Amino acid sequence: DQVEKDAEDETSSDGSKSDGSAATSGFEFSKEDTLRLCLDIVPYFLKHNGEEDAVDLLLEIESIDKLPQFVDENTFQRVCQYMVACVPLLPPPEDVAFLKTAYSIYLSQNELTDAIALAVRLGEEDMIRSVFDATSDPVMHKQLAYILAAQKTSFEYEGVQDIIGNGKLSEHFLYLAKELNLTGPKVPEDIYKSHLDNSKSVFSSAGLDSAQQNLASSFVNGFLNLGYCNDKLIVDNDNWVYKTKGDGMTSAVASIGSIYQWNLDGLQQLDKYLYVDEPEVKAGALLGIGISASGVHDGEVEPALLLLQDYVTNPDTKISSAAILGLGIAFAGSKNDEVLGLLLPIAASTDLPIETAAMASLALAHVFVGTCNGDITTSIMDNFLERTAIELKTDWVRFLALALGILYMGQGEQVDDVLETISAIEHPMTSAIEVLVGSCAYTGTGDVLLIQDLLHRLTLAYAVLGIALIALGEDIGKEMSLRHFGHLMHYGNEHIRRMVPLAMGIVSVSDPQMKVFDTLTRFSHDADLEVSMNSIFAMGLCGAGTNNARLAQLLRQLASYYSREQDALFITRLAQGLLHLGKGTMTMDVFNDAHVLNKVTLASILTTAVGLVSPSFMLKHHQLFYMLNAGIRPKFILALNDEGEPIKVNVRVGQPVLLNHGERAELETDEYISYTSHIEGVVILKKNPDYREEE
Amino acid sequence: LKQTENDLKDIEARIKEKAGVKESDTGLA
């Protein structure tokens, strides 16, 4: 009771890697005389080899000093490997500070096995270099970098990344410039782009005649060409774009940016439309570059985002509309104060028709997520409390409220400045935030009061999204969540109606449901025509990257809508584009194979929920249709040999008869034992001495 | 908007069912 109550309420973290840590350092969690009582259990299970039942009593007492004293002699491999899947969570609560104090004893020895899983999860600087010390094979150092680079989370933005990615010659560092491209989505994403040329499906691309019909003509080309490069249709005819004017010209050029996605340099081909005559033509160029460079902060071999950042300055409107929205996508993973310093005075007056600052709240959320900055924390906090300029309407108030409900993830003591803005103005989405602060601060979740308390407020749109994230890691509230999702689907306001399909579309890939598609039938005509115009596009968001199969019931609903008017001809094209989006095969991944969570994919869901509402109530901008591409993760399963470089090798079959390096597949395991941390996705395999083969 | 009209069928009509239906069901039907 002394160590539990002292380690319960605190503003700091828990655990230390120092060898002289008795857990008496700093704040005193327990008396000095009572410390020897916890060590009395160590000599008991030491000779008896009771480590199986010794961990059971170690997690209940919550003592960080007991673990490093228990492990002394004999084998550090089999004994420590059992603690990998046992120690961190047996009980519903999560204590991550136990494995941190045991690093000092292993520092002189460690092992090839237990030092692997220590580099992921918390990911301390001493844990990553620990496995590199006992590994004398440069091949095994490569495999350890694939699971770490895909984790992102803590270390993302500039000042950490690309500084380590340079590299030198040493045994304790060994980060190659090629490993950053192989581990991270750099080289492998380009092979999938070229491999789609042979596997491409039929194309609906047509240019028609009239400019009113050229808007839907070029717009569908952006969805069809995702992951595909077609230079024949764009270069041969330049009239299918320029004929569009107003807000349609910006969305037409953005479709070309999807062609150049995952390319070395996409700015050269888009330079022709960068400056011609009219600002409306110049506006679409900025939105197209952000789509082509989305997913990579530094590019591949060159930082192509250096020139894009300098184009944000402009007194005009249509260009500034696509400058804030277009650039707020490709900058994920790269933090710079030059774009923040220029955007701060523009977002002060927040005038929609002139400066078009309404998208500044969504741009700052997708870029700076998972970063540490004192400039954006202080400036937005003062502007929110002062309520300066003309700000009155709740629309812009909810933008700054939901923008600050993101950046504080992965912070700790920096969250206290954000909490002042949350408790200032009450919001329906900010009531559930107070109980979710302990998720990131206490390093994990699953307590009774951290889940069930969210279900009482539901029986607005932010609380239902958090249920899907907690149910993936809990076997209790997961079964009862299926019933609560059906009652929240029918409600007066449209905010909760539009949130459910976005959350169910990810769950429904492996679990189709008839009740979800049947609601979308009556979801079209309800009250206002704005819901009907948004209903056609909402039914395509769930079927993105999938055709026929389970969607055959949903496909019949979109076939009855062709053209009911001049505008309906364009609206129905948005449904056909998402159906064939990515040549018919795509996916949505909110997590990775490292058993962690990415704050970028989570921030893209909250950003998409705020935007995209142009056809629905609260008209903002028609350029928000491309927001979905910011959160779409690639789908591939790689394979490697002992050389570490990409090479053709055969693995287990997928969903198409063989899977090579750079070919599409998802959720496929392997029976071959790898070197270090055999998992899904990219892995370096090996062959047993029994049979000798090159495949 | 449509939430009131859904329950309106079971509310406004219930008032008429008190006098109208009970009189038609008189005689232990």
Binding site: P428, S431, A432, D453, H456, R457, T459, P512, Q513, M514 | D7, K9, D10, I11, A13, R14, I15, E17, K18, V21, K22, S24, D25, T26, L28, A29
Partner: protein
């Protein structure tokens, strides 16, 4: 809690007036009725347990979609009109429904029953994986499977083994529960089996142990019941009328098919009759692993030694073999069963079935 304090609390205060008009129609002396037929004219048929069958008018309380023929509702003593519907969460509507998604049993874990796998795989997995092969021949793949033998070996293992490779949800329905306690629910439970599994249909329906309802005798009276014919006649129309690509599957189990209704068989819809095969060394070790897990055994006790010399016993005698071995330790007052008790109990059960087969034949 905090969010709903400013929402639900002022909501119930404004909705209190509508609740006062409800209770006036509700009334204190309520009763439980029984539905028969529902018509769009707001009229129904209700019965209280003393059987005064009535006919009354349906008032306005809840949507008609919540009302289903054959259910229980609420009544009042004045006009006997329906004042509300009874909650069905406590009383199960079907007989026995257990939904098992992606079970543990597979084709490789059932032992030497592979001879039975080749027959069930062609009638289940083959039309599901490659439905286009039957379109060229213009034939309907049989959705039914007739199982023989005793439970615990052939019927229990193979039932859940087919759902693993086909990625199907296992539904176990007791066959002796097809006549359930009430008159008029025969055609209702038959539709609920195909209705729940008809929307999605990654599922296979399983039925076992029918000794009764398959026999209509010479009439529905003089010892017979009408509930027997309600389920049998409706099951024939639902199985023959419903055709699909091989998603929905219904598999029954019976020891003797001579007593079943030949009209219910409907030849050509179910072409699959699977016999019972004897377990090999692999299957017998699976039954022993369940009982010997909690049973105490020394390091000299091996599952391969017991199955080496055996009379090839069924699942009932194998379970009784380990049962008799435990009585030898109770008479000697010991908690540890040695290897001699398993060998001694194996010979006793083996000699209780077949020994000399009445030696003869010259």
């Amino acid at each position: 809690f905090v969010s709903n304090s400013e929402i639900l609390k002022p909501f119930e205060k404004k909705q209190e007036e509508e609740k006062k008009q409800l209770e006036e129609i509700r009334g204190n002396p309520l009763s439980i009725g029984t539905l028969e037929e529902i018509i769009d004219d707001d009229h129904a048929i209700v019965t209280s347990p003393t059987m005064p069958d009535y006919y009354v008018s349906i008032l306005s309380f809840v949507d008609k979609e919540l009302l289903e023929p054959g259910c229980s509702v609420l009544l009042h003593h004045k006009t006997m009109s329906i004042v509300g519907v009874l909650q069905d969460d406590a009383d199960p509507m079907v007989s026995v429904m257990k939904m098992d998604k992606s079970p543990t049993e597979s084709y490789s874990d059932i032992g030497g029953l592979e001879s039975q796998i080749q027959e069930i795989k062609e009638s289940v997995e083959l039309p599901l994986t490659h439905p286009e092969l039957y379109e060229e021949m213009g034939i309907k793949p049989p959705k039914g499977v007739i199982l023989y033998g005793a439970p615990g070996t052939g019927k229990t293992l193979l039932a859940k083994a087919v759902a693993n490779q086909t990625s199907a949800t296992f539904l176990r329905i007791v066959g002796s529960e097809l006549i359930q306690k009430y008159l008029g629910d025969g055609p209702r439970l038959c539709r609920q089996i195909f209705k729940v599994a008809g929307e999605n249909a990654p599922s296979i329906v399983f039925i076992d142990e029918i000794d009764a309802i398959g026999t209509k005798r010479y009439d529905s009276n003089s010892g017979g019941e009408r509930e027997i014919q309600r389920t049998m006649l409706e099951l024939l129309n639902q199985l023959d009328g419903f055709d699909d690509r091989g998603d929905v599957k219904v598999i029954m189990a019976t020891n003797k098919i001579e007593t079943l209704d030949p009209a219910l068989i409907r030849p050509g819809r179910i072409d699959r009759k699977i016999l019972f095969e004897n377990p090999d060394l692999s299957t017998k070790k699976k039954i022993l692993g369940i009982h010997t897990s909690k049973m105490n055994l020394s390091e000299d006790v091996n599952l391969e030694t017991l199955v080496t010399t055996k009379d090839d016993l069924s699942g009932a005698d194998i379970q009784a073999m380990c049962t008799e071995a435990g009585l030898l330790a109770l008479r000697e007052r010991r908690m540890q069963v040695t290897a001699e008790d398993f060998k001694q109990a194996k010979e006793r059960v083996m000699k209780n079935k077949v020994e000399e087969n009445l030696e003869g034949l010259y």
